[PDB]
Write a protein that binds this ligand. Structure first.
Ligand SMILES: [Cl-]
Ligand SMILES: [Cl-]
Ligand SMILES: [Cl-]
Ligand SMILES: [Cl-]
Lengths: 265, 265, 265, 265
């Protein structure tokens, strides 16, 4: 039988659902009355979904068995319908390294699709705020749309502002920087951070890491660290457990630093 | 001059501070009037710290320069004065994979020092709750002490309860399991999860992964995945950028699954 | 001008050549008079190759520039026209770990395409020998053909023999085992090895590693080790040096052991 | 009983042996009459070794059980009594990528302890030759001593010569370069290689990789590749198989290229 369960997860018109099938295909869709999805596994009648609930079965016209799920933020970030993102394996780590916590004031720039922005927004809680600087109007509006859909827009002030003139905010708890040329903005980042505030940026190349580190070392920053991660999945076969054949080899070099007031008395 | 800055970061008696020095030694201490720290860099008079602020310099008796910092949760987890933990590189990822978010109800068991518990507590927000089952009284009390110090105890209900009889809660959003023998508890975990709820566990060995996967595959779980990560730091020398000589080779295999109501109609 | 250079590299009818183009496509072909290759870059007239030499340019009918090269053993193993192999990243390491050297007597079983066999054959020198047991006639003949083409057949005695009855040779220097069920052959391997002789095998799964280790530990073997390697290539762009986007995540777990005469006096 | 076995492995005065104990300590020593080794496991009387053979047991004065082994080249390279080396995980791979084979003429510079030199010497066979340029007399003599002990000196011509004036040899099959500043020698390397000859170098830092790649790209070289490898060992416990806690994070970036005669007709 249909369980009432968690009421906030009740499926209604306009909700996002994730339909997951035996061959591991997944479809992220907006629920709307009288919509049909045409897939390689057959037709899915979304009207049926309104009479079901998360964790329940849905069958295609061809009898293929799928399950109705509530998408996670990761699901949304990955099924991003497509631009460049900070991937979840990195964003989660970066948010913890930045110690983002309830009530924090955080600067994020640029914003892009809002994927990293969303992670930071979850972490600041209802009482914190992300000041998200994005001079590219098209991305400001994409992020606004995504963050709204993801239930996080109330926690993010999107500012269509060029950061060359500096940030408006002072004494922010942490700052994440993701721009093509981070070395050109490190001074402004330093100025915005509280004493003991935390800085992170991502660089795609080793050349960029080198240049960014040089700039950090010119300013009052300590505890400078550079990290990369490799995540490897395994075939979930109890009798034949082994890594998958191919993996992602690289997303980004992550650089962290802590602001101090001065180098010397 | 001393900047007022972020008022909640004001240093007072009983606060935790992190003192960070040029040779990269770091000391996590409770601030108390008239306490001195004796270190290989000299004596630090903590009375001085009350007249300073985060990001400011403190000198030892031997003239060595350090900085006063507010410890992060990572700092607290790592400077754990020592038992087995889920490391931050894993806990951050696991919390994001579990989609832990504002208002979520989460089961955590066992608890240990509370390191993973803390990550989950930050993620559920002020409106969520972590039900933390820990039958070992000594660890229940350690976790209570740590979570209190870390400003998170209001979000965690520590239950000194054996999980062999099942969990009290139903329809929880996600569940994290960390026990020596996770295969013996998967049924109870399934029962506690909402439809579409998310499960994670950690296993130190490949044998344990194999056994846990077998048990998951007997129950109504889909989207089963197994992950490991390797994190590599670099020497932050702009002119000689290269990985450090030695790294951590292994913490844990991470296993995830999503609860569904049934395998077949 | 055409340089005489290394005379043994002179191109003649029946030689293998590797033609390498700007878009990184490579074509491994047998040189024969009046043959043409039809490719996505145009037609290559192999008659032209006989009037050129290694390191020289060859143009397709469409004006695309390629270079004539002598294929390496790696090139031959990879451009294997297709069955399961031990990959070069592993075979090179395994041969060094086995200390394969001039004059050594080495057992190899099974053989397959002869890829690992070839590596061992190079390592034993002109005075050593590889005893290659391959009960599958089709693979015995493939390996014979490959090893002949690769100039190594004089160093390999291919024996179409079932290893269930043991090896004919005693006191061999090293032994490489690659079969679906290595645990069923470890006793026979031990019997064939000299005192202090070296054993290696490869296993695709962690389950197989576990079973193989159990069997090794029942016999007089010491210095038991298990290795895996990850090889990551980089984009060779001086101004934008970074890892390629995707890599191989897994070939094989490698297990090594050294034979001793007995566990106790 | 004592088995005659492989006669070339007979232990005699002046031979190197490796004594391997239960706690995994290993001692590489020169066998000499009336020598005793004093270790944390007790005294080993080397006179006893002359009455034993590889794979046989030797007991210390304190009753601890060890085994007599013939050291491998890896053992010799690692138990290097200490300077900078190319590690076996890299040297084996590099020698295969360079396609070093019977009869090849190979340039190696610098030489150092001769560790990489030895790998190349094994690979060229009795009919090939390594021209090893080492202007540092102390390292020329160390390498000569090591290569002699390792049975490879007949295959290596050590030249105490500065490479700034170029190499004497032309049309060599492959060349390995290991110097602090490889970009300053790439022209001379190109000049020495045959058409289709293979080049490799190692760089400790990403900066050095960038500079070396720039220089390669100025000259007639194709198939330029950059590789790194991570090797991870496992605890060989069948019931608790998992990676060791800590591993080597970095040895060297490996760069390869193939010489062609010219960039354009
Ligand atoms: Cl993003
Ligand atoms: Cl924990
Ligand atoms: Cl093979
Ligand atoms: Cl070396």
């Amino acid at each position: 039988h249909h369980h009432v369960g968690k009421v906030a997860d009740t499926l209604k018109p306009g909700d996002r659902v994730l339909l997951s099938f035996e061959d591991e295909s997944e479809f992220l869709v907006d629920l709307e009355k009288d919509k049909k999805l045409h897939t390689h596994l057959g037709i899915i009648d979304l009207n049926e979904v309104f009479e079901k609930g998360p964790g329940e079965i849905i069958r295609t016209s061809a009898g293929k068995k799928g399950y109705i799920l509530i998408p996670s933020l990761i699901d949304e970030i990955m099924n991003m319908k497509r631009t460049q993102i900070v991937y979840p394996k990195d964003s989660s780590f970066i948010a913890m390294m930045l110690d983002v916590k309830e009530g924090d004031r955080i600067i994020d720039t640029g914003v892009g699709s809002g994927a990293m922005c969303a992670v930071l927004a979850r972490a600041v809680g209802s009482s914190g705020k992300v000041f998200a600087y994005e001079k590219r109007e098209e991305f400001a509006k994409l992020a606004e749309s995504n963050l709204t859909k993801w239930g996080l827009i109330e926690r993010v002030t999107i500012k269509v502002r060029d950061i060359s003139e500096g940030f408006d905010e002072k004494d922010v708890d942490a700052l994440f920087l993701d721009v093509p040329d981070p070395w050109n903005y490190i001074d402004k980042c330093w100025e915005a951070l509280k004493g003991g505030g935390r800085f992170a940026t991502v660089c795609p190349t080793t050349n960029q890491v080198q240049e960014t580190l040089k700039k950090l070392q010119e300013l009052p920053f300590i505890r400078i660290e550079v990290w990369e991660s490799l995540f490897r999945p395994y075939k979930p076969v109890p009798e034949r457990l082994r890594p998958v054949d191919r993996m992602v080899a690289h997303t980004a070099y992550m650089i962290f630093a802590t602001k101090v007031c001065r180098r010397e008395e």
